[PDB]
Every structure is written in structure tokens, then in C-alpha cells.
């Protein structure tokens, strides 16, 4: 059990791969943030080694455009360094042109199309209030 609670936030009209993509790239961010939620390698039967997983939880969730829109703002009010994926980085798979379109954009007038977040457990609440696990 963990003082922290990882939570991912959808914009619940993507498709079902644009959701997949963005989860991956968030999570990406996340453990890059904090490297210490990597376990020990996982071993099979056969004596076979796999790649160490998150040994923490984390929770899936989605929402709408306005919706995902506060809880961004409420990361940042919070002071809470998140990970973020645009809609108009679908447009390149470059991290550079990527970069450089997300600094396009400001809280007030990005198209949010993910988030994710590790933070005490009690203020990731707080941040996604409004937001439905997702199915």
C-alpha cells in the first residue's frame, strides 16, 4: 500500500487505439517521474525473465473535453507535475515536433486528450473529481 495514487484520465470520444497510444506515452512520463514504482523482474515457471512492472496500482479513467480541461488546471493548482497529451499530437510522431506543438498551447486553450498523474492519494481525488472509471 502507497502514500500515492497513479491515475490516467481519457477523453472518453477517442478511439479505442488513440486511448491505448496515449496511455502508453503517459505512463511513459510516469515512470521516467518516479523510477522507484519498477519492482523486481518477473520469472515464469520455465525459468524464463520478464521485463520489472509498476508495483503500484493504477487507476483508468475518463472523461469530456471541459471536464479533463479543470482536472489539467487542478494538477497545476495543486502543483502536481503531470504527464499530458494533446489532440494535435497525433499529427506527427516526432518527439521534437511534438514538443514544439504542445508549447503551442496554454490550460486555458489546449484540446487535452490525456493525463496522468502520481500523487498523494488524497489530492488525486481532489484533482479528478468529475471523471468516470472507465469502462
Aim: hydrophobic share 45%; charged share 25%; no cysteine.
Amino acid at each position: 500500500m502507497f502514500d500515492t495514487k497513479i491515475a490516467v484520465i481519457l477523453r472518453d470520444d477517442l478511439a479505442v487505439w488513440q486511448k491505448l497510444n496515449v496511455t502508453a506515452f503517459l505512463m511513459s512520463g510516469i515512470v521516467a517521474q518516479t523510477g522507484e514504482i519498477i519492482g523486481e523482474p518477473y520469472r515464469d515457471g520455465a525459468g524464463n525473465v520478464y521485463n520489472p512492472l509498476s508495483i503500484q496500482p493504477i487507476v483508468v479513467m475518463a472523461t469530456d473535453q471541459e471536464a479533463l480541461r479543470k482536472i489539467h488546471q487542478r494538477s497545476l493548482e495543486r502543483d502536481i507535475t503531470t504527464s499530458l497529451y494533446i489532440e494535435e499530437m497525433f499529427a506527427t510522431g516526432h518527439d521534437a515536433a511534438n514538443r514544439q506543438v504542445f508549447s503551442h498551447f496554454s490550460p486555458d486553450t489546449a484540446k487535452v486528450v490525456g493525463m496522468a498523474l502520481r500523487a498523494d492519494r488524497k489530492i488525486v481525488d481532489k484533482i479528478t473529481k468529475g471523471a468516470k472509471l472507465h469502462a
